[PDB]
Design a protein around this ligand. Structure first.
Ligand SMILES: Nc1ncnc2c1ncn2[C@@H]1O[C@H](COP(=O)(O)OP(=O)(O)OP(=O)(O)O)[C@@H](O)[C@H]1O
Ligand SMILES: Nc1ncnc2c1ncn2[C@@H]1O[C@H](COP(=O)(O)OP(=O)(O)O)[C@@H](O)[C@H]1O
Lengths: 735, 195
């Protein structure tokens, strides 16, 4: 009448020798309920992955609790059965036929074990059960020179009739004291890929965040491994650890890595399955989970999508899941014990959406920040991946890897993995289409398929962006170095002196304004800023945030600002802020005033945004509200007037570069001198319209004449009056 | 928040007794830090009281809950700076210092900046900027009521209870309120127009 439902694994205590393979400490009631002899085989369902790891069984001494079961570290490493998993029991399968060859692999060693061998076979098969594809044991004591050695035994050369058995366990009948089947030591084989064994996630698999992962590992290791030392201080160790970052950074991967690499008990939630219609069922389930958590001293708590599980109460008090669950989790994690050893890992995509009650120094003082990988991190990730599938399947030199990393500057580790997968599948498809069923080893991996892969896949942001790769560069634009010397320092201040700002307390005003006459270089200056910065750029313009619906503009503003906050320290730019700046003039609606107040509060009100930098562009800065025209925010003002002689000459030469200068008949200076009162846009359009005049004669031409240029000059107008220039100058004088 | 509570609860007939708790001031923060130091005992730290006043002064909007977290993260910083540097040296000698506390208060980033009421701002007369006549006048009309309320009640004239300030947007119009709050030691209410 016990009715056992789910079982939980546990390492075998006391070490020694004992069983070490078929402990299976289970209460005799469950043994009688299964109608199977205790001196026989047992199964662990572990949900799915058929094969069920048929291992022999043994009885306990009546104190071992029913729920918990022991699978030993050897089987735990063989099947990657991590702590806290659910298990099921069923009748054993047919007896194994026989074992044929069995071959050792000598994991992470240079082999040459004959000196320390000492008839390993007896040490390997001095145990009952023992599944041939998996044996992992401690080095114990082997002759002199201590050291540690491990063996890979995954490869096999036999087959079993049932397809259910994934690891095709074999029986043991050989001889040993304190000769085999044609020896067992041969070659340093790795994990067998034929059976597709689940490869454990190594601690070195993740990279590019070495400082962050080291800090996280130390912060979670010092409470568990040094509980008495921390309790001596009397301040008690916290249990909450916060993980956040942009999507695709692999936070779940590092959670899995730290769970696998830690021998302590680990617990994780399976998403919204805990949430149920019954009010008390969820509370009872959470209480039971916490009880099982602190019943054993070494325990790890993993929480995923805490934003969905614990949404902000102020943002939406829909009901059912509400602040009550936040309060009950806070009470549960506040007082499980005085010192204890418990750490809770919470991963959320949007920290702002999380309940601010969770984000408090009293409960979640320690935070871990993960950002977008840079060039070095992406290069390291690519090198790790190439080492992961080995040089036998691809050829890529270090310079090629660096070039690929530089080309894909806006990507992430998940993006790189998807790029590798798509490159592999496109290479396979090309080989199938062209080479007519050739061996895949000859074609391997090249550069053209990968280049086409990054061309086709496109960055995962799915938003329009110049990206600086296919757009205008610095050499294509000729301007004045006076503004360049200013902007380089201005945008190198935050990216390079964040620690200096933190130490000194001066911080950054984060306010820059650019005003220019119509037809001048203002959006050009913004593009130059974005190009030189080399950071993701959001193309936002004034009327874009405006919408017919009331309140939609505020929603769009909040969306773009929380996207910029999560898009690393960058620059946010407004193409035409003159649409919303004037409120007193023109009798602006209440929506414009609300948007202006919201942006005023966002720039330098109540909160400070250290990450993003606000740059604004206006067609006319004289009608702007006095609230925004305040020192501290958007204080810097640059005249950035029309291009001077050298800049105009460079622009003309760049436009004439497509043409031929020798046969053009111009010296590239007389045209600039004559076209001095025109705007930059008009100057650019002059070359195109003169080319049209030249090609008027017989369509495609190779010669341009002075009469065409004269007609082009006569047929166009500058459209700029001295009155607006005088007004713009008066704006500078008045400020 | 009593506002979120049903106003039927906030009835004088039943719920007459009310206790108001505010953010600790400099004196309360200093007392809390001294009590925490006494609780954690002098054998695990080497600190002096002037550093305690310095820490209390440096914390303006910090809440009492923030101080414990600051101490714990300072302990973590000291433990890391010992371990990663000296390769698991004895922690008794390192005890507690001021550099870890400074790093903790730099990187704590408390979420108590936004509030409708700030309690005891800290700014001394050696930091403010203004003219002598304004300081003398403000001293006169802060010393009149608080020291002659009984005299005014006897004379039946009370106090003006009104002061209007107007000047350049630079300074000497807003920091004067903080200076008065710090000097007088009286409860200070700051109201923002657009807020
Ligand atoms: N930096 C990286 N290096 C190598 N592989 C990576 C990297 N980032 C992601 N990957 C690959 O992409 C997969 C996705 O990682 P993971 O599931 O941890 O994503 P995540 O960013 O935590 O997001 P989500 O929770 O939505 O899955 C990994 O299992 C791995 O195969
Ligand atoms: N040298 C150039 N080459 C190509 N395009 C240019 C050049 N200089 C300016 N432009 C274009 O002219 C536009 C300038 O806009 P601008 O007149 O400053 O807007 P506003 O009228 O609001 O001030 C930019 O969008 C840019 O694409």
């Amino acid at each position: 009448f016990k009715l056992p439902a789910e079982f939980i694994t546990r390492p075998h205590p006391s070490k020694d020798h004992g069983k070490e393979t078929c402990t299976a400490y289970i209460h005799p009631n469950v043994l009688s309920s299964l109608e199977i002899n205790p001196g026989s085989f047992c199964t662990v369902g572990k949900i799915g992955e058929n094969g069920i790891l048929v291992i022999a069984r043994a009885g306990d001494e009546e104190v071992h609790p029913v729920n918990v079961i022991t699978l030993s570290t050897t089987i735990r490493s063989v099947g990657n059965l991590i702590l806290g998993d659910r298990l099921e029991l069923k009748k054993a399968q047919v007896q194994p036929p026989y074992a044929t060859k069995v071959t050792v692999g000598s994991l992470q060693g240079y082999n040459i074990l004959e000196c320390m061998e000492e008839k390993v076979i007896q040490k390997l098969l001095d145990d009952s059960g023992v599944i041939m594809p998996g044996m992992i044991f401690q080095n114990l004591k082997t002759k002199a020179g201590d050291e540690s050695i491990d063996v890979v035994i995954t490869d096999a050369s036999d087959d079993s009739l049932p397809d259910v058995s994934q690891l095709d366990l074999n029986m043991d009948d050989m001889y040993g004291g304190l000769g085999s089947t044609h020896i067992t030591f041969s070659k340093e084989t790795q994990a067998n890929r034929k059976y597709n064994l689940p490869e454990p996630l190594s601690y070195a698999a993740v990279g590019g965040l070495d400082k962050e992962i080291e800090s996280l590992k130390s912060a979670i290791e010092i409470p568990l491994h040094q509980p008495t030392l921390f309790s001596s201080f009397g301040v008690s160790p916290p249990r909450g650890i916060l993980l956040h970052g942009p999507p695709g950074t692999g936070k779940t991967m590092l959670l899995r890595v730290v769970a696998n690499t830690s021998n302590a008990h680990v617990l994780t939630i399976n998403g919204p399955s805990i949430v149920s219609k019954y009010l008390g069922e969820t509370e009872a389930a959470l209480r039971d989970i916490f009880n099982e958590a602190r019943k054993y001293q070494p325990s790890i708590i993993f929480i995923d999508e805490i934003d969905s599980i614990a949404p902000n109460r102020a943002n939406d008090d829909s009901g059912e899941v509400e602040s009550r669950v936040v309060a009950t989790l806070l009470t549960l994690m506040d007082g499980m014990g005085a010192a204890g050893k418990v750490v809770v890992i919470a991963a959320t995509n949007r920290p702002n959406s999380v309940d601010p009650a969770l984000r408090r120094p009293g409960r979640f003082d320690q935070e871990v920040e993960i950002g977008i990988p840079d060039v070095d991190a992406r290069f390291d990730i690519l090198t790790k991946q190439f080492s992961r599938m080995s040089s036998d399947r691809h050829v890529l030199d270090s310079e090629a890897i660096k070039y690929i990393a530089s080309k894909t500057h806006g990507y992430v580790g998940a993006d790189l993995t998807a790029l590798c997968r798509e490159s592999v599948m496109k290479t396979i498809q090309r080989g199938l289409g062209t080479d007519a069923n050739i061996d895949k080893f000859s074609l391997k991996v090249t550069l053209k398929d990968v280049e086409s892969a990054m061309v086709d896949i496109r960055p995962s942001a799915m938003r329009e962006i110049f990206l600086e790769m296919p757009k205008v560069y610095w050499s294509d634009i000729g301007g004045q170095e006076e503004l360049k010397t200013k902007m380089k320092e201005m945008i190198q201040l935050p990216l390079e002196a964040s620690e200096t700002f933190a130490r000194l307390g001066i911080s950054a005003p984060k306010g820059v304004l650019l005003y220019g006459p119509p037809g001048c270089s203002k959006t050009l200056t913004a593009k130059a800023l974005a190009t030189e910065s080399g950071i993701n750029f959001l193309a936002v313009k004034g009327p874009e945030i405006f919408n017919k619906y009331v309140g939609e503009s505020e929603r769009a503003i909040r969306e773009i600002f929380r996207k910029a906050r999560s898009a690393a320290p960058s620059i946010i730019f407004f193409d035409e802020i003159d649409a919303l700046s004037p409120d007193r003039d023109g009798s602006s609606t209440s929506a414009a005033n609300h948007v202006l107040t919201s942006l005023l509060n966002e720039i330098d009100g109540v909160e400070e945004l250290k990450g993003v930098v606000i740059v604004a562009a206006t067609n006319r800065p004289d009608e702007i509200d006095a609230a925004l025209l305040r020192p501290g925010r958007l204080d810097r003002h640059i005249y950035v007037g029309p291009p001077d002689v050298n800049a105009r000459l460079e622009i003309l030469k760049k436009c004439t570069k497509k043409f031929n200068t020798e046969e053009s008949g111009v010296d590239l200076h007389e045209l600039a001198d004559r076209t001095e009162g025109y705007s930059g846009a008009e100057v650019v359009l002059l070359c195109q319209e003169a080319g049209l005049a030249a090609i008027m004669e017989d369509l495609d031409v190779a010669k341009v004449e002075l009469r065409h240029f004269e007609k082009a000059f006569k047929g166009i107008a500058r459209g700029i009056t001295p009155e607006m220039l005088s007004y713009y100058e008066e704006f500078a004088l008045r400020s």
